[PDB]
Design a binder for this molecule. Structure first.
Ligand SMILES: CCOC(=O)C1=C(COCCN(C)C)NC(C)=C(C(=O)OC)[C@H]1c1ccccc1Br
Ligand SMILES: [Ca+2]
Ligand SMILES: [Ca+2]
Lengths: 219, 219, 219, 219
């Protein structure tokens, strides 16, 4: 009798059972940071991990039985699938980072609690309207990063030797973080006019962000 | 004597006298900071402090007789109690710290001047809307602080050794405080891809902030 | 005698004469910056400044014969008065800083050109709305300067050694300037809990400002 | 007959064709940034460029036939002209700052795509309303830059030795970047009241900026 399992997943106790579970693995993962805790009580913490990872895998499968193909247009579930799946690749071999990846699963507190999903809606939703302004700027970064690599990358490789470096550096300058005493004044000992580059650049990059914040605000 | 006391506390001179005294204690507390000045007046001051702390103690008692239970449903009045109270623990016995905490009674000039109560009130009133966006931020901070301890706490313990440290650093980075030349460039000498953590983090953190302001303005 | 002079001061020639003299002086003052120029043309422009100072003085006297009381209840005319008067104080010997206040006379470009006054006035108009907030800030900064000088002033005399210094260092923290790697991290080497003064202070100091601006928008 | 060419220029293939060319050269110019790529494909890109600068040149000529005297009244076309003109001067052997200036041609992506031109058009559009404020700021900066040179250039020539420098530092202090520990605290070692120049300065420049944004928002 299909509808019988299908009704369990939708219950208020199931989700909250899961919500109460994630909060537990999350607090677990916190204590997992304490080096003292991890070998004074480490086995319980390894155990909770396999249980919860199994239980969550069960929970996702049930919702798959229930939702069938309509599960794969729920971003939240797609997220849940990929985030639980992540926590399931075997540690042995491969990437130790995937082992760190597991904690992303703590974002399920977001996935399972309606206000957070609703908070994100305010967050995600101004983004599509910005992609155009994000397009102009990105282009600018791409153009200026290039000019910065050719003008300063020979003598200042750490900062500008490569395209990526001009980007990472320019972002920094864009965040305005220790940009003068830290990047331009040194440049200017070798290339006295480097300010004719950065000062306009900062302007454009500063100006755009400001007006971008404005168009967001009126709405 | 109920009405007789009631007419005292409510007079325009008692509060003005008490307010005047606050302005007086505040002038002395500033004065107390000079170690020269202390030698000449140290005792001289020491008593004005104990006089003012008593006069105020009288005040709190008088105001309580009039209101009984209605005194302790006034958030502004509770604060006055708690602020004068902790100034009652003796100059030792627990921590020389309480001795520094007592300066909080100058927040009484706020307490006693109505124009200020509205500004503070206007200020406090923005907060409840934020508590949803605030909570969400705390989760992201909690998740990333964990990944950060595991990723960077071994080679860079000052910055990421513990959740606390991972937190503190992240807050700093959140403030974009010397974040670039000062933290992420050093991380990258060891973990070249560390920019994949902070650059996305900085994005989320500055973005959510915008909308925290956006939602404030619009609402 | 009245109108003929009166027919002078409201005339487009008079003000414009005074305007072109500001701009010329604004240009002459740039030249005075180079030791090189001053070396071989210094006596040339030391005199030009003098004519203009006289001309501005004649100008202030005239507007007074014409206006009298009306003159000294006009803020833009009062500034001019004061910004001309200060420029009347002797350069070479005795007091040296007033010699530097002279270039303040380039602010006469603001008073004499109508689009500037309106923008300055629009700008000033914002101020009354925020004075309650501003008073609050100074009480708040003060309260904190006291706690700071006594908490940290001993091991970090430079940063908190004096009431005035703690105001200063705290003001820096509000600009978020090099605040963490630069101040709090160091403070924490000795006083691990110093983040309990500065992280809340930061949140609050950030909070109020944001609201002051939001207050401007709403106003 | 002149009519026959005119129908080619105006086609939907044409403008789309040029855009597509821009994106190739834009991808291609990222490739000129890698010396590695240059030891294999450099010969392809040194000429792929040259025919693009040829094709764009042919195209600019064409658009001049079709639009006549009205072409040099089109802001976007005028740019195309100059940004293409720059790209034609061969290789080295003059001022080779110009070889990198070639990349400004990737901004034709902006001129030729209508959403980008709007944002940009929208963005520039805020400028005319700022020009009164920019004028004021620059008069403020220029004034404070003069003063800094007379007060601080002797002992701190790197920073205030000359007007330009004084300008630069003041710009830096305005972006609030490592201003205290980086500039003013060192100043104060020799000239103790420098905080009185810089903190009011810091306020004003901060005051205007906040207030201009509010003006953007309401209008
Ligand atoms: C939210 C969890 O973060 C923490 O554990 C910390 C608290 C408790 O969290 C409070 C978070 N909030 C007040 C900022 N005090 C704050 C303030 C820290 C921090 O770096 O946050 C900016 C760290 C910390 C904890 C234990 C021992 C040392 C440290 Br150092
Ligand atoms: Ca810095
Ligand atoms: Ca900084």
């Amino acid at each position: 009798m299909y509808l019988r399992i299908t009704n369990i997943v939708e219950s208020s106790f199931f989700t909250k059972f899961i919500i109460y579970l994630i909060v537990l693995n999350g607090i677990t993962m916190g204590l997992e940071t304490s080096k003292t805790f991890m070998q004074s009580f480490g086995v319980y913490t390894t155990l909770f991990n396999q249980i919860v990872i199994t239980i969550f895998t069960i929970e996702i499968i049930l919702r798959i039985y229930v939702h069938r193909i309509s599960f794969f247009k729920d971003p939240w579930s797609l997220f849940d699938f990929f985030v639980v799946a992540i926590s399931l690749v075997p540690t042995s071999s491969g990437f130790e980072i995937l082992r760190v990846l597991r904690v992303l699963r703590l974002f399920r507190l977001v996935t399972a609690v309606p206000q957070m999903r609703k908070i994100v809606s305010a967050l995600i939703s101004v983004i599509p309207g910005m992609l155009s302004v994000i397009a102009l700027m990105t282009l600018f970064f791409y153009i200026f990063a290039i000019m910065a690599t050719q003008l300063f990358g020979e003598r200042f490789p750490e900062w500008f030797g490569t395209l990526g470096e001009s980007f990472y550096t320019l972002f920094q300058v864009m965040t305005l973080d220790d940009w003068s005493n830290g990047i331009v004044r040194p440049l200017m000992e070798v290339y006295p006019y480097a300010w004719v580059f950065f000062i306009p650049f900062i302007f454009v990059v500063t100006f755009v962000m400001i007006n971008l914040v404005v168009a967001i605000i009126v709405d």
